[PDB]
Design a protein around this ligand. Sequence first.
Ligand SMILES: OC[C@H]1O[C@H](O[C@H]2[C@H](O)[C@@H](O)[C@@H](O[C@H]3[C@H](O)[C@@H](O)[C@@H](O[C@H]4[C@H](O)[C@@H](O)[C@@H](O[C@H]5[C@H](O)[C@@H](O)[C@@H](O[C@H]6[C@H](O)[C@@H](O)[C@@H](O)O[C@@H]6CO)O[C@@H]5CO)O[C@@H]4CO)O[C@@H]3CO)O[C@@H]2CO)[C@H](O)[C@@H](O)[C@@H]1O
Ligand SMILES: OC[C@H]1O[C@H](O[C@H]2[C@H](O)[C@@H](O)[C@@H](O[C@H]3[C@H](O)[C@@H](O)[C@@H](O[C@H]4[C@H](O)[C@@H](O)[C@@H](O[C@H]5[C@H](O)[C@@H](O)[C@@H](O[C@H]6[C@H](O)[C@@H](O)[C@@H](O)O[C@@H]6CO)O[C@@H]5CO)O[C@@H]4CO)O[C@@H]3CO)O[C@@H]2CO)[C@H](O)[C@@H](O)[C@@H]1O
Ligand SMILES: OC[C@H]1O[C@H](O[C@H]2[C@H](O)[C@@H](O)[C@@H](O[C@H]3[C@H](O)[C@@H](O)[C@@H](O[C@H]4[C@H](O)[C@@H](O)[C@@H](O)O[C@@H]4CO)O[C@@H]3CO)O[C@@H]2CO)[C@H](O)[C@@H](O)[C@@H]1O
Ligand SMILES: OC[C@H]1O[C@H](O[C@H]2[C@H](O)[C@@H](O)[C@@H](O[C@H]3[C@H](O)[C@@H](O)[C@@H](O[C@H]4[C@H](O)[C@@H](O)[C@@H](O)O[C@@H]4CO)O[C@@H]3CO)O[C@@H]2CO)[C@H](O)[C@@H](O)[C@@H]1O
Ligand SMILES: OC[C@H]1O[C@H](O[C@H]2[C@H](O)[C@@H](O)[C@@H](O)O[C@@H]2CO)[C@H](O)[C@@H](O)[C@@H]1O
Ligand SMILES: [Ca+2]
Ligand SMILES: [Cl-]
Length: 496
Amino acid sequence: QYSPNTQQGRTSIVHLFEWRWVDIALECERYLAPKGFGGVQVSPPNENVAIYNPFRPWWERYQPVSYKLCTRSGNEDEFRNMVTRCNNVGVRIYVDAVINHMCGNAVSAGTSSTCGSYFNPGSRDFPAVPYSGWDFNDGKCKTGSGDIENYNDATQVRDCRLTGLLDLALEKDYVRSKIAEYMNHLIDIGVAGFRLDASKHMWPGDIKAILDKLHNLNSNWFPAGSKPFIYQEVIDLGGEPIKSSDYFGNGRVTEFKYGAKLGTVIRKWNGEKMSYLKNWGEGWGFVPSDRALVFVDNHNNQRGHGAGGASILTFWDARLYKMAVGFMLAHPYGFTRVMSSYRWPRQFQNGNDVNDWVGPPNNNGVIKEVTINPDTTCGNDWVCEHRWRQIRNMVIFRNVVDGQPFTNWYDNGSNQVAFGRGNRGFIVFNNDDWSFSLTLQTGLPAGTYCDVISGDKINGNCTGIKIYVSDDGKAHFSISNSAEDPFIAIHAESKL
Ligand SMILES: OC[C@H]1O[C@H](O[C@H]2[C@H](O)[C@@H](O)[C@@H](O[C@H]3[C@H](O)[C@@H](O)[C@@H](O[C@H]4[C@H](O)[C@@H](O)[C@@H](O[C@H]5[C@H](O)[C@@H](O)[C@@H](O[C@H]6[C@H](O)[C@@H](O)[C@@H](O)O[C@@H]6CO)O[C@@H]5CO)O[C@@H]4CO)O[C@@H]3CO)O[C@@H]2CO)[C@H](O)[C@@H](O)[C@@H]1O
Ligand SMILES: OC[C@H]1O[C@H](O[C@H]2[C@H](O)[C@@H](O)[C@@H](O[C@H]3[C@H](O)[C@@H](O)[C@@H](O[C@H]4[C@H](O)[C@@H](O)[C@@H](O[C@H]5[C@H](O)[C@@H](O)[C@@H](O[C@H]6[C@H](O)[C@@H](O)[C@@H](O)O[C@@H]6CO)O[C@@H]5CO)O[C@@H]4CO)O[C@@H]3CO)O[C@@H]2CO)[C@H](O)[C@@H](O)[C@@H]1O
Ligand SMILES: OC[C@H]1O[C@H](O[C@H]2[C@H](O)[C@@H](O)[C@@H](O[C@H]3[C@H](O)[C@@H](O)[C@@H](O[C@H]4[C@H](O)[C@@H](O)[C@@H](O)O[C@@H]4CO)O[C@@H]3CO)O[C@@H]2CO)[C@H](O)[C@@H](O)[C@@H]1O
Ligand SMILES: OC[C@H]1O[C@H](O[C@H]2[C@H](O)[C@@H](O)[C@@H](O[C@H]3[C@H](O)[C@@H](O)[C@@H](O[C@H]4[C@H](O)[C@@H](O)[C@@H](O)O[C@@H]4CO)O[C@@H]3CO)O[C@@H]2CO)[C@H](O)[C@@H](O)[C@@H]1O
Ligand SMILES: OC[C@H]1O[C@H](O[C@H]2[C@H](O)[C@@H](O)[C@@H](O)O[C@@H]2CO)[C@H](O)[C@@H](O)[C@@H]1O
Ligand SMILES: [Ca+2]
Ligand SMILES: [Cl-]
């Protein structure tokens, strides 16, 4: 469960948040495969509640109605078409599996669902699965409200209703089997693994019982005996009784300390300084690197949901954001997920975004096409961070330096730092309020190297900054503190 099952040499996945299956299928062939991406986390592919108050929020997809593959992203044929075409060019699909719960206990009964399935939350009836009253934890939960009241109590976090969401009785073999039937349906279509949503609200043993029932990956694309990649969403910032290490037996865990600490460092809040990143990783209290799924922001905390707080960097803070993502993608700790978002009319009232609910770009609920502009950016309000040159070239950086040790670290005692990855890549940052001009040891073979942050290598030429490494591995680096991108990166495959 710990290995992502990407094609060898492909080291990241991208969360194509709320994209449609047809758009993802095309993106695999025209972009993700040629640019060396490892895979795509898709939004939950199972039927959810169509919520109209407010109007079709992104988070209606975390309120399941059934396990039919029938959503605003597409129907089952399009989902299958996507996974096949993506696997056919060597780009994996990972499913956001919402398996802790069904919809909100207060949603109205009816057919307001993305496949029109009937469901009745008051009476606990989900006949399209089918689930009924004795498939939820109403009788297990001990809180007064029936919802989770106190996170210092590990048992109610598991058996009670996360913000009112009907809590599946994951102890029963029937519920475990119905979930496993859904997941095996996905696996045989060809998915490489799963994000387990709200894993902190499931017992590690119940998760295990579910995964024990799963097939091996589809043997047309994966070697025989491959198991699905598992990363569990556990928000563990410390000080709670539940520890993400309690989930290491099922697979990797999301490491939410990563983005919170890195964002604090890059914003230079709280006295933090990039020079402190010299022991980045477990030295900062993070989970072991082989159990970490890392990311700068995710779909929740880029909009104030979940956790991570004010320090989280997002596409809204683009200049610092590219630096954070670049550092993450260059540093060997963890398996990297890159966020890919859409813009929404973010409108802060008292420090709260009253439109943090707004769903994907849409006309009357029908999700807009991801259009591709002539400059390879996206139209229709898809941000497409994974197409930003500085991010995409760092995804390639991580591929190129895969397996090389962290080495040749430099810092100025403040916010000017550099480090290499064996003899295959080297990266230099200036986050101080003055300029950086220094000759550094790069660990690279002598030559002329395109900076892949400011430009590209294209047939014997660089379109941006050139870096000249001497026979002793030293090279001069010049970064003004007013630089648009105040960092430079070079690697073995940007060498002329
Ligand atoms: O056909 C007409 C029919 O309509 C209703 O039944 C339908 C129901 O509304 C609908 O949800 C679905 O039923 C599903 C059910 O939703 C699922 O939960 C699933 O049920 C299985 C269950 O989850 C398993 O735990 C297992 O049940 C065990 C129980 O754990 C035991 O307690 C014991 O049950 C007896 C119980 O002790 C007594 O208190 C008493 O209430 O009677 C119970 C019957 O013995 O033994 C069973 C062992 O079966 O196994 C369940 C079945 O696999 O799967 C159901 C089937 O889809 O579809 C229902 C049928 O349409 C309405 O409730 C019915 O009265 C009516 O006949
Ligand atoms: O039904 C009546 C009901 O109304 C209210 O609740 C509704 C709510 O207002 C509405 O926004 C929506 O809820 C959304 C939710 O806003 C979304 O954020 C989203 O949450 C899902 C999320 O995408 C998942 O990644 C996942 O995040 C969970 C974590 O897994 C949890 O561990 C937990 O994080 C806590 C963390 O564990 C702690 O360390 C600490 O940091 O506190 C954190 C609290 O954030 O919560 C996040 C939530 O983001 O799990 C989510 C489920 O998949 O999707 C939700 C569903 O659409 O729907 C609500 C119910 O309809 C009102 O709150 C209720 O009291 C009332 O009963
Ligand atoms: O879009 C702008 C703002 O909208 C969001 O909050 C809105 C809701 O989307 C609206 O629907 C409305 O909410 C009302 C609701 O319309 C009203 O029916 C009533 O809800 C009842 C419910 O119908 C009833 O069945 C039962 O469930 O009890 C509910 C009340 O407890 O009351 C709701 C408000 O209390 O108004 C709000 C506020 O504008 C969006 O999330 C906002 O951030 C956004 O600014
Ligand atoms: O009542 C629920 C309906 O659910 C399904 O809807 C149908 C529509 O009724 C058809 O009209 C059509 O939808 C069109 C849509 O009308 C058209 O504007 C355009 O929608 C998007 C487009 O997909 C997208 O690429 C974006 O860029 O722009 C447009 C929005 O501005 O194209 C849609 C077709 O792709 O087809 C859907 C379903 O395919 C259901 O099938 C209906 O039975 C039902 O009425
Ligand atoms: O392991 C699956 C199982 O976990 C829980 O049982 C726990 C209980 O919560 C602990 O407090 C103690 O009793 O040990 C048990 C095993 O770890 C859930 O209660 C149960 O429903 C679930 O299946
Ligand atoms: Ca639970
Ligand atoms: Cl996540």
